[PDB]
Design a protein around this ligand. Structure first.
Ligand code: HEM
Ligand code: HEM
Ligand code: HEM
Ligand code: HEM
Lengths: 142, 141, 141, 142
């Protein structure tokens, strides 16, 4: 499972993360880089362009909630499966989001973290965080 | 399709990459090897320790090919024809791995560019790297 | 790339499909809905019961578009341009789903062809269906 | 989990399966339709063409073993994860096969079953068998 070193790469970097900023970034990037994901946010209003998306208050607020959720994995690295069970039912049975999109959001978060923490986001750190988003993606695909 | 704006955003970032082809290429390769260890089996002949000559020399070659692709974005297939035959017929590279390396390249870019690696920049490179990947794997179709 | 042999193998199988566009299209759609229930959310306006008029009418339209693609294999993008704008801009179809429907279509073909759906035939249709899928999703790139 | 009806769609169809024929078919098709998979079979000799692959004795024998393995899932539908644990380590740590290829082989098997049992391979049957190969692919990706 998680090695003490991996857990350190995760907890130490997350303690510095601006959840609202990174969350809004990750979600806006998901909608912009993989536009079909916009299908699930018809109620968020104008998403007609990259700029419209980056200035969409609802998109930003939502990303904040998403990254906050990721935070619950960081804070309980050994019970990720149990922690996301509820959200798993929500995204599958209720929202019908193809699991592949969970992996894509994860990849986006990895890139965002890199742009915010170039010095600390070493290859080893990336390995630990990639393991993290993958575990969340796995738990949600449950 | 890649727009003119995409191309401009790509070029602006790329002239920086060209100044350190070796550094960037090696960093992208090492992140792939460390994050996705299965990719290492394609390089058994390589000394895979950090900054090995083989990794550095190869990283520059990869960046070099990507640079050529940037230069001939409207004529990718022909430009990468030789490389496409190599990765498919000779190396048998699993298509999934092109996505892994493309992703690691974006991480390197994001790390080096900071707030300049905007969503618009990421889109352009995503489109670009996906197009290059499609060509390097077209021999499978 | 699709070879002449691929095209011939495709045509031989397709003239059979053309004789029952409605039956085949509907069967491929229903397998997708039943096997991959998430795809049903794209059709809330449809009565999705077995053999409903909407499913049958739509199945024939899908087969019809594929038939047109067979006819213009060397000019896919242009031929499907209208459909590509529809699936990307209007319907926001997840690329993954094109693979699901392509796969279900192969199952329908395999079931109807029996031992005639050889590996060579499967290759040709895989190449063909993947090319059609790429075009219907190119608006995302 | 598995509904009695699903289990019936699986066990009844499998009792009629010619393991050697379907196995050879599935493996030959994997190597032909997704040629990069040939990378893992350099010792099997000539795989230089579709015909060469279909007449490759080793490829055929191997498919037989693969489908025999699938048989162990059919025969113990509730312990698939435990049954394939050994093979999971083999394909990952030892062979380093990307998990995505497990899904591709599964899809191929679905198509092969369809060409052999058109009458019985109904949409409902396909749903049950798709659930099966996916579970095997999941267990192996473990
Ligand atoms: C795998 C990473 C993901 C995590 C951790 C996550 C987490 C969450 C959480 C916690 C909520 C509830 C919002 C609230 O607090 O009210 C939510 C809602 C939602 N998510 Fe995700 N999500 C993920 C990926 C995705 C993906 C990939 C999609 C599809 C593009 C998606 C689509 C949605 C939608 C449509 C909602 C409903 C929001 C609304 O109706 O306002 N999510 N997600
Ligand atoms: C961004 C996509 C890629 C590009 C542009 C690219 C480009 C190249 C080039 C130009 C060479 C030849 C270098 C020379 O002439 O010395 C090469 C070699 C090679 N590539 Fe790639 N490549 C890509 C992705 C991959 C991937 C994903 C793998 C698998 C993990 C891979 C495995 C190899 C191997 C094994 C060689 C042989 C090199 C040697 O023995 O020195 N490549 N590549
Ligand atoms: C083999 C790939 C596909 C082809 C060739 C295709 C072709 C078409 C065509 C020609 C139409 C318009 C029918 C008309 O004019 O009445 C259509 C409509 C539509 N398609 Fe597809 N399609 C494909 C895949 C998909 C997939 C994977 C989905 C998502 C599950 C999807 C969802 C839809 C929807 C929702 C409509 C609207 C139809 C209506 O409201 O009647 N399609 N498609
Ligand atoms: C997910 C479905 C699969 C199952 C159930 C499966 C099962 C097996 C089994 C039971 C063996 C041992 C052969 C023996 O009896 O000695 C084996 C070997 C092997 N498998 Fe798979 N396999 C699967 C998919 C794959 C895929 C997708 C690949 C990659 C293309 C692959 C590559 C190999 C290789 C290289 C061997 C070693 C055989 C040798 O060295 O002769 N397998 N598999």
């Amino acid at each position: 499972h998680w090695t003490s070193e991996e857990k350190q790469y995760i907890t130490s970097l997350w303690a510095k993360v601006n959840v609202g900023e990174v969350g809004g970034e990750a979600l806006a990037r998901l909608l912009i880089v993989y536009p079909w994901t916009q299908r699930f946010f018809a109620s968020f209003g104008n998403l007609s362009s990259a700029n419209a998306i980056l200035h969409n208050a609802k998109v930003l607020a939502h990303g904040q909630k998403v990254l906050t959720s990721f935070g619950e994995a960081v804070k309980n690295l050994d019970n990720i499966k149990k922690t996301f069970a509820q959200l798993s039912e929500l995204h599958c049975e209720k929202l019908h989001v193809d699991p592949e999109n969970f992996k894509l959001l994860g990849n986006i978060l990895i890139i965002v973290l890199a742009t915010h923490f170039p010095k600390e986001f070493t290859p080893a750190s990336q390995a630990a965080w990639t393991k993290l988003v993958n575990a969340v993606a796995h738990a949600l695909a449950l | 399709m890649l727009t003119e704006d995409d191309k401009q955003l790509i070029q602006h970032v790329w002239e920086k990459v060209l100044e350190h082809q070796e550094d960037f290429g090696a960093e992208a390769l090492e992140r792939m090897f460390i994050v996705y260890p299965s990719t290492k089996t394609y390089f058994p002949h390589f000394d895979l320790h950090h900054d090995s000559e083989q990794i550095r020399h190869h990283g520059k070659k990869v960046v070099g090919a990507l640079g050529d692709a940037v230069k001939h974005i409207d004529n990718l297939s022909a430009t990468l024809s030789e490389l496409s035959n190599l990765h498919a017929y000779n190396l048998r590279v699993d298509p999934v791995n092109f996505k892994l390396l493309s992703h690691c390249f974006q991480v390197v870019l994001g790390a080096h560019l900071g707030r300049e690696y905007t969503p618009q920049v990421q889109v352009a490179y995503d489109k670009f790297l996906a197009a290059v990947s499609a060509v390097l794997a077209e021999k499978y179709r």
